[PDB]
Each structure stands twice: as C-alpha cells, then as structure tokens.
Ligand binder design. Structure first.
Ligand SMILES: *[C@@H]1O[C@H](CO)[C@@H](O)C1(F)F
Ligand SMILES: *[C@@H]1O[C@H](CO)[C@@H](O)C1(F)F
Ligand SMILES: *[C@@H]1O[C@H](CO)[C@@H](O)C1(F)F
Ligand SMILES: *[C@H]1O[C@H](CO)[C@@H](O)C1(F)F
Lengths: 146, 152, 153, 156
C-alpha cells in the first residue's frame, strides 16, 4: 500500500548532519504516507553495503535525492542515475542557494534532470523542507495517482 | 562490428582539457578497435548550454548510455563529476560493461576497500575489480586488463 | 574585551543547515566566553547575492577576518568550501589563531599525514596539530584542546 | 620596461598524471613567454605522489614560503569547486597584498552570486570595477597586453 521512497543523501557522513538534518526530512516524507528507506539508517563490508544499497534502489518506487552541495554527492548521483535508467519516480531536493551548473536552464548539471520532463521539471524540484508537504508538487500528486 | 564505448568525463568543460586530454584517451581506446562515443563532441556541448538546448543535450547523452556497450568513466577529481556519476549509475542499472579511469593520486573515499565512494564499484566484481580500474593513459592498452579481455 | 572567533562555514548556503547546524556550534563557542562572528547573519548573505551587492559582501567578510582574533573553519565537505578556504588562507597569512572543524568521517587528502589537503594545516604546528582539529561539536569545549587553552593560557 | 616578476602558479593540475604532463607546461610556457619567473609548486617542491607523513609538513611550508616570497599568484581556478589548496594559497596572497590573477577556462559556473562566475571571495582582493582584466579564460589570453598581467609587468 505505502509507496516506498529511497532517500539518497550525503547527510549520513557528518555526525551533526545525520542527527539533525535527516530526521525532519524523514518526518515530512512520512507525513505524506510514504514508506522511507534511508540508507544510513538501514545499513547500521564495503561490497555488501554497496549491493545492499543497490538492492534498495532497484526495489524502491521513487528516489528522493538530496542534491545539496557543490557538487552533489557522487554516491547520490550514482543512485540517481540508477533510478532514471530503471524508470523509478524521481524527486530532487536542494535548499542550497548556490548554482553549480553547465547550462542556463537548470541550477545544476543538466544530467540530474534527464529523467524529468522538459516542462514542469520544477514541480519535482523541492527547495525547502517546508515544501515537501505541498499538494501542488509532484510528490503529493504521484502518491494520489496524479 | 566494433564494441561501443561511451567515454564519460568532465574534460569537455575546460578548453585546454578538451583539446589536450580527451584526444589521447580517445586514441588509446580506438587502438583497441573500439568505436568511441565521446559526448562533448558527439552531441555538441561546447559552451555553457543555452536554455533551449539543455534538454536535447541531456536526452542525447542519456540515449548514448542506453545504446553503448560499455562506459569508460573518467573519475578524476574530488569528487568525481556529478554528470559522469549519473551516467555511470545508468550504466550499472542497464548492466553495461563498466570501466573506471583515475590518474588522480588524491585519496577521497568513504571506505578503505575502494579508492572512491563504494557505490561507484557496485557494478564491478567483489574480487578483481582492480582489473577494470585504470590508473594511467598508457595502461588502457594493457593486454592483461579488463578492456582488452572484454574484447576477448 | 571578549576574544573574537570568525565562524567560517558553508552552512549558511543551505536553509536547513543554516537553521539547525550553525546555532549549536555558535552556542558551543559562546559557552567558552567567545564572541562569535558568523558571517552569513552578520553580513546578510541570505540568498544568491544580487550583483550590486556581491562586492560589498566580499569586503565585509574580508574585513571581519582581518579584525577577528581567530578563525573557526568548518571544513566539512568534499572538498572543503572554497570561500571558507580563501578566508582560512587570509587567516593564516595574518597570524590569526586557526581552529578547524570536521565531523565528516570521509578522508579526502593528498598526503598520508593529514585528513585533508595539507595546505589547510600549513598554519598549524608540525607536532600537535590534532589539538586544533575538532571532530565533533561536543569536543569543542574540551578543557584539553587548543581552543580552550588559547582562551585561558 | 618589463620586470622579471615572480608568479606563483597555483593549480590542481599536479594531482593527475596526464594533467601534470600536458596542461601545466603550456601554462608555464605562456607565463615564461612574458619574461616571468614561474614558481610551479608541484615541480619546485617535489610533490610527485601521495606524500609521505614525514614529508607533508615540508611540502606545506615550502608552498607557503613560496607564496610569501612571490610577487603575484596565478591561480588556476578550474573545477567545481576550485581546488581547496589553491584557494588557501589565494587567501594568503590576498592577505599579503600580492598581485592576483585568476585562470579559468572551465565553462561551468559554481557561484553564490550573480556578479562573478565563482564564489565572490575569490575576487575579494580584486578591484570592484575591472576585475575581468585580472581574469583569464584561455591559455592564449595570458600574453595579451590589454590584460592586467602584461601591464603589471611593465608598469613598475
Ligand atoms: C555526460 O558526461 C559529461 C560530464 O558531465 C556531460 O557531457 C554529459 F553531457 F552530461
Ligand atoms: C566568508 O564567510 C562565508 C563563508 O562562505 C561567506 O560569506 C564568505 F563570504 F565566503
Ligand atoms: C601546495 O599544496 C597545494 C595543493 O593544491 C598545491 O597547490 C601545493 F603546491 F602543493
Ligand atoms: C548509497 O550511496 C550514497 C553514498 O553517498 C549513500 O546514499 C549510500 F547509501 F551509501
């Protein structure tokens, strides 16, 4: 019943970030009725962690990729490319106001948006935790069939 | 028929790097008998992409990754280029052959097994993934390394 | 007069990081009696800077680094923030006290001695640089590390 | 006439075998064609590979000493973001009142402001108006006499 979101991020790498940033994002996602697979939580060797994370990406319904930073985290980027090729739902989160881009259309490297529509890709692009609950944005719509 | 290799790199972004670093790498790959898809040339991303061409560039690079036989991924830098990494993840998800290239001697990893983020090797064997990891341009020709063996 | 620490970080660029990550660090520094200059709030860089403002922001942060007594440099990230590093270099050249913060467990270096690019430690002593290298917000108040000894001694 | 000013050539290019070999020498040549004494730190201070623990402090102080003693920095600020070691060096250069020249032939933007293509602090030691003259976007452009490096050499 619950849609499953793989929450890809670099926030597990920093003690303070793991503790303070991830839980509010998880709460906002769960308040939408989503089942959240957060990889740092679900983990707790290197090869087993990689295949574990690979299996989760294969089996999610959508990825919600935290793409903060200059540049976005390379592991998130790989997990995002996996998700595009496997036709998962794609949602992007960036509340970083810096622009690190190769083009005028997008605020980031244009490949991050190759799995998103030409028009209305911004409906999938979240710029604040406050925005996740929005019924006018693609996450809510995708959960309600629209 | 030549096996198709998509050469993913961030080298088309710098004029000097485009001109000096990519052609030698393209050559060593064509010397194995490979057909090389180099996306900055192939799909003409030569400058800061205009708003009305960014989508076409993106969909063109994506289609080459679907249609190649393997990715040769230049993973220099701290960290590896994000577009390269999207393209590499596509490759892994689509079961393409995977070849990694890094002649950068800096060590940036989240784990002590691999010299980079463990997720970059997810598409490579647990044992002998080093055979797929090239550390120098002259190493591409090596007859004991996975690219030559991949052409059998 | 309180000792002045310039809190250099990339955390002001992210809405959530600004709101949740900086205040706890600010408080850990103030608990030692430090006057904390946090440049995003001080010099009002709260979004993508308008062109007519970018130079004034740069001179204000540059002045603040000149007028501080030491820098507390958040050097999380791969690689560390470039603005933080310009500011750190200024701090080194100006013989400010230097303290580095990184609670990111990834190691990202060009040498086997230091966990980061060795230039970041060029203003730190040859032996005992780890006393200037904090790896947790909790560790900041260590009555045994270089920041506490700097305030007191 | 033109003076034999010392440029410290800060770059990430010595980290990559192929970049050390093909990318730096043409930049060194372009600078030397202007009559400059080039201090390229990878070659000058022997940073060849992943430095040994017992060698890393000397590399650091040697790069640092060279930035203290140069007349100007030529900073290759390619990449997203620019290299952190180059940036520390550019920080020291700004604070020591050294001459500042920026090289970026990377067409991507990684910036926090609309005025500059990079973090606005990279330009803090550059003038408010006319900073473009200190900003080089091609190896060919380095020897132009209408740009700030040429003029810095002639003008006292
Ligand atoms: C595919 O690889 C390069 C590196 O970002 C870009 O052309 C691409 F187009 F995205
Ligand atoms: C100096 O302090 C913060 C760190 O990015 C920015 O304003 C700065 F402006 F770079
Ligand atoms: C000093 O270290 C930095 C790393 O970027 C290089 O520029 C150096 F010269 F070694
Ligand atoms: C999958 O890769 C990235 C590393 O950033 C994390 O999201 C993971 F779980 F390890």
């Amino acid at each position: 019943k619950r849609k499953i979101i793989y929450l890809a991020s670099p926030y597990g790498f920093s003690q303070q970030q793991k503790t303070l940033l991830l839980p509010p994002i998880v709460r906002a996602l769960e308040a939408l009725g989503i089942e959240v697979w957060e990889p740092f939580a679900r983990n707790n060797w290197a090869y087993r962690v990689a295949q574990a994370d690979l299996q989760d990406v294969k089996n999610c319904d959508g990825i919600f990729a935290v793409v903060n930073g200059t540049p976005p985290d390379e592991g998130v980027m790989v997990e995002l490319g996996m998700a595009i090729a496997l036709n998962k739902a794609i949602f992007l989160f960036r509340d970083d106001f810096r622009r690190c881009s190769d083009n005028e259309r997008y605020p980031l490297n244009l490949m991050l948006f190759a799995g998103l529509p030409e028009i209305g890709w911004e409906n999938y692009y979240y710029t604040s935790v406050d925005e996740i609950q929005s019924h006018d944005k693609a996450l809510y719509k995708w959960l309600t069939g629209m």
